[PDB]
Amino acid sequence: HMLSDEQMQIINSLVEAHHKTYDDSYSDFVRFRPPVRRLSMLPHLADLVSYSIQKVIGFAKMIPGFRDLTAEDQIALLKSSAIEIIMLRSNQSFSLEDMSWSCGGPDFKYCINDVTKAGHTLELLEPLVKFQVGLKKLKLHEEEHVLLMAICLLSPDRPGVQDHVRIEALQDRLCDVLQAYIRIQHPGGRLLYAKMIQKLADLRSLNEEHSKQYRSLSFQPEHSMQLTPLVLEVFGSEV
Amino acid sequence: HMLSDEQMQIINSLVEAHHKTYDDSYSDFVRFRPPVRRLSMLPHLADLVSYSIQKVIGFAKMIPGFRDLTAEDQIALLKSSAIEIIMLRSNQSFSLEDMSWSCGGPDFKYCINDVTKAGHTLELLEPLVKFQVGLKKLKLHEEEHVLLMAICLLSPDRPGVQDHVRIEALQDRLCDVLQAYIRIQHPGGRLLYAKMIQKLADLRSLNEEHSKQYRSLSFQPEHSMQLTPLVLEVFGSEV
Amino acid sequence: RHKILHRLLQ
Amino acid sequence: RHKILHRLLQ
Ligand SMILES: CCCc1cc(C(O)(CC)CC)ccc1-c1cc(OCc2ccc(CO)c(CO)c2)ccc1CC
Ligand SMILES: CCCc1cc(C(O)(CC)CC)ccc1-c1cc(OCc2ccc(CO)c(CO)c2)ccc1CC
């Protein structure tokens, strides 16, 4: 069988949005507070993460349907899933070799070494890298990788979501394409779809862990003053 | 006549505090978000200013007497005068030659050129530079320069101050030393004290102007998200 | 309540 | 109310 135009349109809409919100040159990183190898990485990583939220937001605004949700629902979806979309989008720079994130080169090559001095512990980093490695192995296509981000972001089972039904539709019309594409365009992708959805479940645990650790950090002003207004607002607890 | 030990003690206490909170190497500037020559300077200047607040706070905590005020009064004094202390402390790097702020070298040499793309207008920059030039000419001693900062910061006529009387005492015991020192240790400083107090009055107008312009900028989230948590909190309107 | 998120979302 | 100012002031 084969996909339909409507479906193909969705894929081109997403893939484009990703391209438009993910700079392969990573030249924006030079504008972050310099990396430094006591939480010496917090400034640079905080900037990287804030910057990523801005990209994740830009991506969402282009997911077809998303822009028609209520401003309230849009936020609820972002606040709860932004951290997962960031973990998903960051895989495109994760390297199995050096086991790190290589972004344009040195200074922007975050080994498990430097990633420690950002306020988080192994209780997060361990599962995180484990995730990046596992995910990196599914050698997804750009099309599938971008779909998974739109699916993750359009999960109606996030706290705060009002219309936990219209979002159900959207995510469903999304999982359809993913299932289809994998069937029609991915050789040896018979057990893929199921492996991907499992990743979305792993993102839930990582989300939980990051949340706990973020709270402890964020409670200490000597540390929260190192963050950015956007990071504070998005990862904040304001209802 | 000559000063007393008590007075001399105050001067050594201040001068030391200034030395301890003002790095002549300006090596901390490398850690700011890089300067960039549309409000391209906002990131770097926001970082410079946030960093300066931290220094101004550190200075205050060492002004004798200040630490005994109520936590509430301490804040009221900082929130209202921090911007003036920064303008006063920044003079130590202002250069009459190039008419700019030279901090360790290039990238950190802010001409009236780059200082424009930070969100402020000539309605502030004009009087500001005018101030820096005028002040730079009073060729103050470190002792007098540091006293003027402690006097400015201990003004009881700032909104929010509760004990507008105990602070009156402190600032007074401060103006005493300044008047004395200028008399006993500054040749040709007969008309100085009066010129200095006039500067404290100019700082009031600059403060007013910055406040107006800060409000407009700070009202636009695309811009306020460029600031830091400390800058937002200190220049904020929270009562 | 979510000043920056709003401005960014339009 | 002034979280960071407080922590810095001690
Ligand atoms: C999921 C954890 C997100 C995270 C949050 C925080 C805070 O909670 C908020 C600031 C701290 C209070 C600090 C550091 C980190 C972090 C960032 C990394 O960057 C990958 C990097 C990030 C993004 C992209 C694209 O968005 C790429 C390129 O693909 C590379 C790698 C590892 C870590 C954990 C230490
Ligand atoms: C009084 C104005 C303070 C100011 C506020 C803001 C904001 O209101 C808050 C972030 C913008 C929203 C942005 C830029 C500026 C600024 C900083 C300068 O730095 C001197 C520089 C600053 C400090 C020190 C020491 O503390 C030295 C070294 O002596 C040099 C020179 C000129 C300017 C006006 C454009």
Q: DSSP of A117-160, one letter per residue? A: TTS--HHHHHHHHHHHHHHHHT---HHHHHHHHHHHHT-S-STT
* Nearest ligand 2 atom to alpha carbon B94: 29
Q: Verify whether the Cβ–Cβ distance D1 to B238 is below 8 Å.
A: yes
Contact (CB, 8 A) for B185 and B178: no
Q: State how far residue C6 is from chain B, nearest Cα, in angstroms.
A: 9
CA distances A224 to A119, A210, A217, B25, Å, are: 11, 15, 7, 27
**B197 contacts: CB under 8 Å, gap ≥ 6:** none
Residue B59 contacts residue B82 (beta carbons within 8 Å): no
* Residue at token pair 């080994």: A111
Q: Which of B218, B225, B226, B227 is best to mutate for the C interface (most C CBs within 10 A)?
A: B225
Helices (H), ranges, chain B = 5-21, 42-60, 71-89, 122-137, 142-153, 166-185, 192-219, 221-224, 229-234
Residue A111, beta-bridge partner list: A100
**DSSP assignment of A73-103, as one string?**
HHHHHHHHHHHHHHHHHGGGGEETTTTEEES
B112 Cβ inside 6 Å of ligand 2: no
How far, in Å, are A169, B53, B154, B207, D5 from residue B72 at the CA level? 53, 17, 14, 21, 10
The two tokens of residue B31 are 């850690």
Is A52 annotated to bind a ligand? Reply is: yes
Question: Which residue has its alpha carbon closest to ligand 1 atom 28?
Answer: A90
* Contacts A74 to C, Cβ<8 Å: 9
| Type of residue at A187 | P
Ligand 2 pocket check for B119: Cβ under 6 Å? yes
User: Among A91, A182, A72, which residue's Cα sits nearest to residue A130?
Assistant: A91
Sign of CA dihedral A27, A31, A34, A40: negative
Residue A228 identity (one-letter amino acid): T
Q: Provide CB contacts within 8 A for A163, sequence distance 6+.
A: A69, A70, A73, A156
Which uninterrupted H or E stretch holds B111?
A: strand B109-111
Q: Which residues of B touch D4 (CB under 8 A)?
A: 229-230, 233
Contact B92, B22 (CB under 8 A): yes
**Interface probe, candidates C1, C3, C5, chain B, greatest B C-beta count within 10 A:** C3
Helix (H) or strand (E) holding A206: helix A192-219
| Residue A173 half-sphere exposure toward CB, CA atoms < 13 A | 16
Q: Are B3 and B177 in contact (CB under 8 A)?
A: yes
- With a CB cutoff of 8 Å and minimum separation 6, the contacts of A235 are A79, A82, A83, A211, A214, A218
Instruction: Fill in the DSSP letter of residue B27.
Output: G
Is any Cβ of chain C less than 8 angstroms from the Cβ of B221?
yes
The candidate with the shortest Cα–Cα distance to A196, out of A153, A157, A145, A156, is A145
Scanning every residue of chain C, which has its alpha carbon at the shortest distance from the alpha carbon of B223? C4
Residue carrying structure tokens 């003079």: B91
Chains that touch A (3 or more CB pairs under 8 A): B, C, D
Q: What is the DSSP letter of B105?
A: S
Q: Any residues with CB less than 8 A from the CB of A161 and at least 6 apart, and which? A: A73, A76, A77, A167
Structure-solving method: X-ray
Residue B184 C-alpha from the chain's centroid: 26
What CATH number does domain B1-239 carry, 3.20.20.450, 1.10.565.10, 3.90.1150.10, 3.40.50.300?
1.10.565.10
Entry resolution (Å): 2.5
Quick one: which atom of ligand 1 is closest to the CA of A91?
A: 29
The answer to whether D4 contacts B233, with C-beta atoms less than 8 Å apart, is yes
* Ligand 2 in reach of B193 Cβ (< 6 A): no
**Alpha carbon distance B41, B140 (integer Å):** 30
Would you tell me which residues 1-10 of chain D have a C-beta closer than 8 angstroms to some C-beta of chain B?
1-6, 8-9
